[PDB]
Curated annotation (Swiss-Prot):
Family designation: Belongs to the calycin superfamily. Fatty-acid binding protein (FABP) family.
Function: Plays a role in lipoprotein-mediated cholesterol uptake in hepatocytes. Binds cholesterol. Binds free fatty acids and their coenzyme A derivatives, bilirubin, and some other small molecules in the cytoplasm. May be involved in intracellular lipid transport.
Species this chain originates from: Homo sapiens
Gene3D superfamilies with a match to the protein in the record: 2.40.128.20
Organism domain of life: Eukaryota
Residues modified to N6-succinyllysine: K31, K36, K46, K57, K78, K90, K121
Entry's Gene Ontology cellular component terms: cytosol; extracellular exosome; nucleoplasm; nucleus; peroxisomal matrix
UniProt domain comment: Forms a beta-barrel structure that accommodates hydrophobic ligands in its interior.
Name of the protein in question: Fatty acid-binding protein, liver
Compartments, record wording: Cytoplasm
Length: 129
């Protein structure tokens, strides 16, 4: 259960540019750019559940490492992909030509999403249990 916990965004880079590019409606971009969203992760072996909350908007997802899964993404689009572990503390997946890497270092999770030259980076910190 390496990843299990509750974490809140501390800061992020290129939210607006990234979200516009992938189809987030601009009213959502404007309300969302300064939201410090909360990620809740339950890991049980290869099985993951996570909830992302960003004011009024709650996305729940689940996947088993190494297997096909269906992920609901930022716009609501559901994509079929595979999430892999690269060691105990790093989740890697690709969907819609976006490469997503989620890495845990103690209490800090860094999420990097790359779409072409745009690198959307989010840094979050554990908040309690
Ligand atoms: C009422 C305010 C509207 C909020 C809508 C804007 C939220 C868009 C952001 C989606 C949640 C963040 C997804 C990040 C996923 C991750 O990095 O792995
Ligand atoms: C909801 C957007 C799709 C998510 C694509 C990555 C999913 C595989 C790994 C899940 C990591 C969840 C990210 C929590 C860290 C954070 O909020 O920045």
């Amino acid at each position: 259960s390496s990843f299990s916990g509750k974490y809140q965004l501390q800061s992020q880079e290129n939210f607006e540019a990234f979200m516009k590019a992938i189809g987030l409606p601009e009213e959502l971009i404007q309300k969302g750019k300064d939201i410090k969203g909360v990620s809740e992760i339950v890991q049980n072996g290869k099985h993951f559940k996570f909830t992302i909350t960003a004011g009024s908007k709650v996305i729940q997802n689940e996947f088993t490492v190494g297997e096909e899964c269906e992920l609901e993404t930022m716009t609501g689009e559901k994509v079929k992909t595979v999430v892999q572990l690269e060691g105990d503390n790093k989740l890697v997946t690709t969907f819609k030509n976006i490469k997503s890497v989620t890495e845990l270092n103690g209490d800090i999770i860094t999420n990097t999403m790359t779409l072409g030259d745009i690198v959307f980076k989010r840094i979050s910190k554990r908040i309690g249990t």
